[PDB]
Amino acid sequence: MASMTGGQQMGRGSNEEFRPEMLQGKKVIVTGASKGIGREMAYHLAKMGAHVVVTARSKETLQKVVSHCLELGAASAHYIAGTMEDMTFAEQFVAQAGKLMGGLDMLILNHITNTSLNLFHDDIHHVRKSMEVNFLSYVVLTVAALPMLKQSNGSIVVVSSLAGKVAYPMVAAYSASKFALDGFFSSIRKEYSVSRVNVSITLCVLGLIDTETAMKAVSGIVHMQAAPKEECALEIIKGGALRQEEVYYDSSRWTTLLIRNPCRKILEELYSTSYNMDRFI
Amino acid sequence: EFRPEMLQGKKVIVTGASKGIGREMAYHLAKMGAHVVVTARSKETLQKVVSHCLELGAASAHYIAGTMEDMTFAEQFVAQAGKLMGGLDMLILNHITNTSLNLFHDDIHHVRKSMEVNFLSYVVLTVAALPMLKQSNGSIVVVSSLAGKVAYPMVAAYSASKFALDGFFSSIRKEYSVSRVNVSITLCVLGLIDTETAMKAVSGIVHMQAAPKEECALEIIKGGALRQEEVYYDSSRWTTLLIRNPCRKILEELYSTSYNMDRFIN
Ligand SMILES: NC(=O)c1ccc[n+]([C@@H]2O[C@H](COP(=O)([O-])OP(=O)(O)OC[C@H]3O[C@@H](n4cnc5c(N)ncnc54)[C@H](OP(=O)(O)O)[C@@H]3O)[C@@H](O)[C@H]2O)c1
Ligand SMILES: NC(=O)c1ccc[n+]([C@@H]2O[C@H](COP(=O)([O-])OP(=O)(O)OC[C@H]3O[C@@H](n4cnc5c(N)ncnc54)[C@H](OP(=O)(O)O)[C@@H]3O)[C@@H](O)[C@H]2O)c1
Ligand SMILES: Fc1ccccc1Oc1cccn2c(C3(c4ccc(Cl)cc4)CC3)nnc12
Numbered sequence: 301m302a303s304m305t306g307g308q309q310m311g312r313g314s315n316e317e318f319r320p321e322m323l324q325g326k327k328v329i330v331t332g333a334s335k336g337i338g339r340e341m342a343y344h345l346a347k348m349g350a351h352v353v354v355t356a357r358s359k360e361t362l363q364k365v366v367s368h369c370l371e372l373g374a375a376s377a378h379y380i381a382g383t384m385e386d387m388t389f390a391e392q393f394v395a396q397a398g399k400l401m402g403g404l405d406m407l408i409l410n411h412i413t414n415t416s417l418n419l420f421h422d423d424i425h426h427v428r429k430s431m432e433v434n435f436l437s438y439v440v441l442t443v444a445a446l447p448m449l450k451q452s453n454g455s456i457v458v459v460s461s462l463a464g465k466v467a468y469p470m471v472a473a474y475s476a477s478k479f480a481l482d483g484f485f486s487s488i489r490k491e492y493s494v495s496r497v498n499v500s501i502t503l504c505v506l507g508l509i510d511t512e513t514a515m516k517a518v519s520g521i522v523h524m525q526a527a528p529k530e531e532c533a534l535e536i537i538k539g540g541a542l543r544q545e546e547v548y549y550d551s552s553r554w555t556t557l558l559i560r561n562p563c564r565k566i567l568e569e570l571y572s573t574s575y576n577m578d579r580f581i
Numbered sequence: 582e583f584r585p586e587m588l589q590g591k592k593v594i595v596t597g598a599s600k601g602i603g604r605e606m607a608y609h610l611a612k613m614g615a616h617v618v619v620t621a622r623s624k625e626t627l628q629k630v631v632s633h634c635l636e637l638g639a640a641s642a643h644y645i646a647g648t649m650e651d652m653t654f655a656e657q658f659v660a661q662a663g664k665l666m667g668g669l670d671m672l673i674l675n676h677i678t679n680t681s682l683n684l685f686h687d688d689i690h691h692v693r694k695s696m697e698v699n700f701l702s703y704v705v706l707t708v709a710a711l712p713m714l715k716q717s718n719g720s721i722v723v724v725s726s727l728a729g730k731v732a733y734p735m736v737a738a739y740s741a742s743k744f745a746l747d748g749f750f751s752s753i754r755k756e757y758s759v760s761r762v763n764v765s766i767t768l769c770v771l772g773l774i775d776t777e778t779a780m781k782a783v784s785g786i787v788h789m790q791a792a793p794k795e796e797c798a799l800e801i802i803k804g805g806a807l808r809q810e811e812v813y814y815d816s817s818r819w820t821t822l823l824i825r826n827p828c829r830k831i832l833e834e835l836y837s838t839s840y841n842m843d844r845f846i847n
């Protein structure tokens with residue numbers, strides 16, 4: 301039947317309004333998918349009938365996510381275990397994932413290095429590791445994924461935080477890595493636009509989410525309402541599917557109303573006329 | 582309101598001071614009668630900056646040559662600079678790794694080096710300088726860009742490193758506030774400046790008006806001296822009208838009541 305079937309899900313109002321069928325048969329990578337938001341995303345994609353390749357360090361937990369993804373109705377589900385501290389693993393993982401699915405439609409970059417809320421003093425090793433895992437590996441994964449994503453006119457989904465847009469104490473190294481993602485990915489988005497690289501980039505700005513790990517890390521320190529991980533995971537997928545530049549997800553209505561920076565967008569448009577790139581394309 | 586006398590006898594470090602904005606800052610500080618320790622890789626060019634700083638009326642002037650790719654050099658440099666001056670009042674973090682305007686493709690080495698030189702060495706320098714800066718109720722001055730606040734194509738690695746500085750230094754500023762660490766942090770958001778290196782890098786690509794390096798250098802020093810959180814310096818009036826993010830400041834204040842830090846300080 302598939303050989304006698306053809307068409308497009310992305311018609312009028314698909315910019316616009318999400319349908320779970322937009323992910324049916326799509327080839328998706330989810331990093332940091334053994335737990336939390338990442339695991340929830342893998343489950344939503346499975347229910348949508350997507351092909352899924354999940355990664356994290358723990359093979360045992362990834363096995364359970366894969367098994368459950370298959371129960372949920374994933375077109376295919378596989379895992380490749382490894383550390384994102386290793387840039388060779390990050391590069392090879394994408395090639396293997398792409399070969400496992402026969403291509404790539406969406407790259408969901410979600411993993412982070414283990415971090416706790418603490419004042420910054422002298423932990424330069426944690427600052428470096430945060431930059432390596434939360435930022436550099438995302439760049440390595442993007443470079444490795446791009447040829448496949450250009451072929452499919454695919455999507456890059458970058459999971460960030462409110463701490464990647466505004467400042468918070470106790471998360472200096474983490475926040476620096478999240479701000480770096482905005483600078484890097486927002487720059488390449490402008491580059492893709494002029495180079496006719498039809499690969500969308502979604503930066504997801506998340507508030508406090510009720511994941512086991514985050515709840516433990518903020519216990520007795522941060523007294524905020526935590527948003528549900530299930531809904532968070534769906535909002536990220538929706539944003540990627542709709543090719544939205546930015547997703548904002550938080551418990552507070554004040555956040556949603558204030559995080560947006562219309563002045564940044566206006567300034568970027570005003571500077572777009574001040575440079576000549578026809579020598580690079 | 583700034584007065585040049587605010588820098589008279591002050592003990593100041595200037596990184597990336599062999600040329601451009603950094604060199605201009607060293608010269609302004611010299612004219613103001615500050616004690617100055619300049620750094621960059623080129624000993625020969627630093628020797629000339631030092632000699633000229635002394636002619637201009639610096640209370641004292643020294644150089645220590647080395648690469649900011651080396652975190653051990655960065656750490657030892659501060660100690661050595663503070664021992665020469667007998668302390669530290671202001672740490673001016675200005676150096677960057679060599680960068681050109683290009684589309685991003687494969688260059689992960691340049692992304693890593695940009696993060697190491699433009700960001701990580703600033704953190705290492707701050708850690709090394711903090712005990713002296715706490716003693717003097719001193720200042721940290723971080724030289725950034727409009728590309729460290731808004732997005733630009735052709736500078737992805739550079740921009741990531743500048744955005745990282747905002748996230749890191751703005752976080753520690755809030756930490757210092759609750760810890761009673763009386764060390765100010767000034768993030769300088771600069772537009773196009775007429776430095777030899779920047780002008781060559783943008784030639785035939787960027788055509789906007791370049792602001793003068795002499796005035797730029799002074800505005801950075803002024804901001805540090807006045808303990809301003811942020812300095813905005815650009816040729817365009819539309820930039821000055823738009824760069825500021827009042828909503829970010831409001832959001833930060835609204836979240837400030839949602840957390841309790843008295844377990845890290847008591
Ligand atoms: N939770 C929140 O409140 C919150 C707020 C804002 C933004 N976010 C963002 O949301 C994303 C997910 O957060 P979360 O709360 O869901 O975290 P989480 O539950 O703790 O999961 C993190 C995932 O990353 C993996 N991981 C950890 N170290 C790794 C390494 N070295 N190499 C590869 N994978 C590694 C973990 O699995 P293994 O340990 O087995 O490797 C796990 O699958 C992150 O980007 C986070 O910054 C979360
Ligand atoms: N110029 C502009 O249009 C502009 C715009 C926005 C922001 N900015 C910011 O302003 C600052 C200064 O810019 P500029 O135009 O004055 O640049 P510049 O003239 O090229 O000078 C950069 C300085 O950094 C030093 N440096 C380079 N690599 C180094 C390394 N590995 N270790 C230590 N020092 C190193 C250089 O000296 P040696 O080579 O001898 O080491 C030099 O003294 C930067 O932080 C930049 O981001 C400038
Ligand atoms: F998912 C995580 C696992 C382990 C550690 C941190 C993790 O991520 C987080 C855990 C908790 C809050 N997080 C935030 C926010 C935040 C940051 C600082 C403060 Cl004071 C308050 C709120 C913006 C909500 N960004 N990432 C995280």
Ligand SMILES: Fc1ccccc1Oc1cccn2c(C3(c4ccc(Cl)cc4)CC3)nnc12
Pocket residue numbers: 575679680681682726727728733734735736771772773774776778779780782783787
């Ligand atoms: F000083 C430098 C030496 C070498 C390379 C970059 C250097 O720093 C720069 C050189 C030129 C412009 N720069 C900018 C601005 C910019 C960036 C990109 C584009 Cl398309 C337009 C305007 C914001 C003015 N930020 N840093 C630099």
